[PDB]
Each structure stands twice: as structure tokens, then as C-alpha cells.
Design a protein around this ligand. Sequence first.
Ligand SMILES: [Cl-]
Length: 188
Amino acid sequence: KLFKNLTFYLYEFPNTKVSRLHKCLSDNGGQISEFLSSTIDFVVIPHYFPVDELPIFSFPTVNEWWIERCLYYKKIFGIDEHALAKPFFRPSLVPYFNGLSIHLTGFKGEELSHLKKALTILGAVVHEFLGVQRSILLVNTNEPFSMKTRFKIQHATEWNVRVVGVAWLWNIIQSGKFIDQVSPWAID
Ligand SMILES: [Cl-]
């Protein structure tokens, strides 16, 4: 099993989610304790839980998306391998993302799904399609540009949609502070 010999501690999850999350971990060889002890391998936080409201944990802390990532690629990642697998949500970022219409390009699978949800709770509106009236075209620069991505960039340039490298967003997530200037991450 994937989560063999691993004990998890679920923190402040709603009752409905707990049972579902319990079954997912249990069916993968993982155990769950409601106590903090040396047995605990990982502390799991809901992805929408405000970082600032989190208590101090003497254990590696991840969100439930870390579990989903582990199952998607069928292996155990480090806690710092992906910014969305850790607690990241800060309510102070919400007024900054508010009103921003964002379309994503170059992202696939679980990363795309998690990114949409991340941007949504942060106060932004994620659009399934590129339109003339998009605030931002967010480009995945960690992958070679597909033909479709290159098309969207050209259209965004013509339609005066801001073309921004994803590093800009990762920097906001990791630092916890919004960045008004996107020019250092523009593709142009
Ligand atoms: Cl749309």
C-alpha cells in the first residue's frame, strides 16, 4: 500500500469530509489518530483553512491536496515539492484577487484542478476559456509552450490581456503577499 506504516492527524475538517478522507487514507494502508504524538507522520489541514489561524505543529504539515497528489502520481512527495500541497490560504490576499478574471494555459491534470480551486478561494474568477475581457492570461512556464498556448498568448497580446508567467503567482502564494507589478514576469 502507498501510505503503509504512516499515521495521519486530521485537523479541523468538517464531519462529512473526515469520513471520506478517513476511507481514502485507510484504503491506502494509512492509519489515523486524533492525538498528537510521536506516532504521527503528517498533520493534514483543509486547503481553505487560513494559515494565520493555524496552531503550531511539531510535525510536517500539509493540506489534503498533498494526499491527492500522492495518489495521482502514486508516490510520496516531499512537503515542500509543491506550494499548493501546503497551507497557503490567507484572507488578506482576497481583496487583491477580487474582480480579477483569469484564464489558465499550459496546466494539465491535477495541477490545473488544484490551481483553479486555489485561485477561486483567493478571490479570483477562473474562466474556462480565453476571452477579450480577461484580466490575466496565466501561463505555465514550467512546461514547453504548446501550439494552443502560443495561440492564446498571441490573442491575449492583441486583445490587451495581461500575459503573466506563473512564477508571479507562486511567489504570491509562497510569500503570502500580493504583487502589484507583473512586468518582471511578463512573457511579451
Ligand atoms: Cl469563460
